[PDB]
Each structure stands twice: as structure tokens, then as C-alpha cells.
Amino acid sequence: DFLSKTPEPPYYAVIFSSVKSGETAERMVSLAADQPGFLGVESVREADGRGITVSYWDSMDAINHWRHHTYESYAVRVAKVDRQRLFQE
Amino acid sequence: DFLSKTPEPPYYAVIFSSVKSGETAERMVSLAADQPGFLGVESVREADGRGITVSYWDSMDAINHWRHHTYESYAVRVAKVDRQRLFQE
């Protein structure tokens, strides 16, 4: 349920780090989920407003057709994932 | 305070996504902070155990001397950040 079950690297990750000043954070998510090349999303938001949401994508090009069909502070970083290790017990 | 003030890409990011089963999550952090090439860290952990911690590093090599001097589920992904956009109001 929480961890995104991603394919073998490489794949991309969009790290959205935010500090809050809603219904619509969740529309913005159905939309990601719906896109071609969308691999999954991990979203977490603490009490005090601090939050990190990472979305995984299959290609730089898949991220552009998403930004295309489309906070006290935030940072958006897009990165190319070359390594992963998954664990559950 | 929350957002890491990172240099111009490229730089690396270590995305640690975890689901909890402590004092020592915080030792593991002083240590990151202390390393050569450590650029910063954003850590967030919700009530229910879900959590994302991303650490930023200047080089793949800076991450190896860290893993070197060194959960119901977790995922560790290392990625190369090629883009960033920072915002605050």
C-alpha cells in the first residue's frame, strides 16, 4: 500500500517538498495516477505543515505531458533514479 | 528551516521511504549532516508510521563514504537531481 512498487532503474522521481500555509491536493493526485508513464506516488504530510510527496515516472518525456495537461514554501526537484532497494517484513 | 537550500543541479538525492513497525533515527541524522558533501535533509514522519526522508549530496562518491563510515517496510532510492525550483512567500 504505501511504498510504490517501481520497475528496475532507471526511472524518474519528482520530489515535492512543501510547508503549508487540500481537496485539491487530492485531485492533483488522481491526475498523476492517471497519466501515461505514471509509476506511483508516496505522499506524507505532518501535523505542523511539513510535507514530502514523491512521484515516480518512466521517462522525462512522461513528466512533460503531465506538467503539460495540467504553500509557505516548496521545492520541486526532478531526479533520475539509478538505484533502489526495497524491503518488507 | 525545512527546505534544504541546495546548490545548482546536479546533485544527488537519497529517498528513504519507510513504514514504521527512533532516538536512533536522530543519530543517523547527525551523522549525515556531518559528512563531507552532505547538502541537507528533509525529514517528515506521519502519525500512522508513514514517512519520507530525503538527503541531498554533492556526489555519488560522497554518498559512498557515508554508507561507508556507517521498519514494516522501506525503500531506498538514489537519484541524480537535474532540476529544481524553490519557492517561498
Largest interface pair: A-B, 39 and 39 residues
Q: Architecture of chain A, according to CATH?
A: 2-Layer Sandwich
Could you give the order of the helices and strands of chain A?
EHEEHE
The oligomeric state of the chains shown is homodimer
Output the radius of gyration of chain A.
Answer: 13 Å
**Outline of chain A, from the CA principal axes?**
globular
- How many distinct beta strands of chain A? 4
Termini separation of chain A: 14 Å
Please give the count of helices of chain A.
2
Strand order of the largest sheet of chain A: 2-3-1-4
Q: If you consult CATH, what is the topology of chain A?
A: Alpha-Beta Plaits
Largest sheet of chain A: 4 strands, antiparallel
Beta percentage of chain A is over 45%
- Total discrete domains of chain A: 1
Helix content of chain A: 10-25%
Helical/strand content category of chain A: alpha+beta
CATH class of chain A: Alpha Beta
PDB class: structural genomics, unknown function
Keywords: SR435, protein structure, Structural Genomics, PSI, Protein Structure Initiative, Northeast Structural Genomics Consortium, nesg, unknown function
Assembly: dimeric
Entry title: Crystal structure of YQJZ_BACSU FROM Bacillus subtilis. Northeast structural genomics TARGET SR435
